[PDB]
Design a protein around this nucleic acid. Structure first.
Lengths: 114, 114, 113, 116
DNA sequence: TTTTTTTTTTTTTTTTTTTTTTTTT
DNA sequence: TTTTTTTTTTTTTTTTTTTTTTTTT
């Protein structure tokens, strides 16, 4: 028991790659894709800077995996909502981190936009 | 690199450290601190209770919120934070990647809780 | 069948009244309370401020259980659900109520002190 | 004079009408439109598939967003909208005050994204 | 959104075995 | 966040009701 917390990330952008669908030992499927969003802003100069961010989306929700399998293609615009989680991993010699947006059973959402 | 996108993360969790307030050239301030959230869930296969605690790096460039943080935010306090999620590359070769929750002017929000 | 949509409201504020718990036919419970949020601004006057009172209706059984046990008038909470409006009829007339609904699986409640 | 609170509502749905743009004293603009969203779910006792459509009144005071709406927003477009949720009383115009509930997009607090 | 690059938090009970290369107006 | 007060939209994925009041740079 830790204290209750909120951890919610909402994104709207474009799919950068063709989603990968893996099957877990047991049948359960997982889907994986990359989503681009952008910002733009003037420097503190008025010169005019831009930034694209690539978010790794990992989907465990079986119904949404299916929808991604059937319909989701590189270049599609989607809304994605989940939780933001970082994991370490080692490779036989410090650990590397990745950060992933996770869509679990009954907690995530995906809406096809375009 | 220009289509309008959405990038919004919202967290409620516990401050892990005394905030660091830095003063930049010309006097704008920037605050950073680490925020812990946790999830708790039942494994898919076994039904065992599981948890995981994530530590989020928060970076505040909003001057009104940096001031509030300077005055009021201590190790151990509970807060709501809202911002945008961005990853930046830094060295040093062997490039390194860090993921940060950024609060800029008029996009982010911080509320003091418990 | 309609097109997929998004309807999500998040609130942090104070509970205005003692939550009401009712039992529906067949044993499901429903909980109901009122939550105050505030806004502050200057009237481009003022020095201006506004309290809004949101009706929260909770159908999620685990959350109703927590509310029954723990939620009291005056408590600060985070509430998240979806915004829905409802007409009803009296007299002789058609009124409208706005409610924030927390369904099975879709809403969340966090006690903040 | 009041504790800090959060009031954030986010919607993706369809514009129901041609937006209405009004110009106020001194030239600030305000735009108004109705946005439809829907839910679909299985009834609890019955398992019967049910649906409900909600029409949200959106009132936009941010001038950059009012501009984009004037230029671009038409009946039938899909949009993302983010604002705060606010109820107010009016009359009536002789008797009995009436509540109306509105999603307000203030300057720098709200957001609007064209979808489809 | 720096010129940076997290070491730590709390307690009104509930989801790999991995490690994104690329997108749009 | 007016001086107002929805009547309509799309198809790519919550009862049987109807809030009276709350808090603190």
């Amino acid at each position: 028991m830790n204290e209750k917390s909120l951890n919610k990330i909402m994104l709207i952008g474009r799919v950068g790659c063709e989603p990968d669908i893996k099957i877990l030992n047991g049948g359960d499927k997982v889907a994986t894709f990359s989503l681009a969003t952008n910002e733009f802003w003037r420097d503190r100069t008025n010169e005019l800077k831009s930034k694209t961010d690539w978010h790794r989306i990992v989907v465990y929700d079986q119904n949404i995996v299916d929808l991604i399998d059937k319909y989701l293609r590189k270049g599609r615009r989607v809304y994605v909502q989940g939780s933001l989680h970082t994991r370490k991993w080692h490779t036989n010699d410090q650990p590397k981190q990745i950060t992933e947006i996770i869509l679990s059973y009954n907690k995530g959402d995906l809406i096809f936009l375009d």
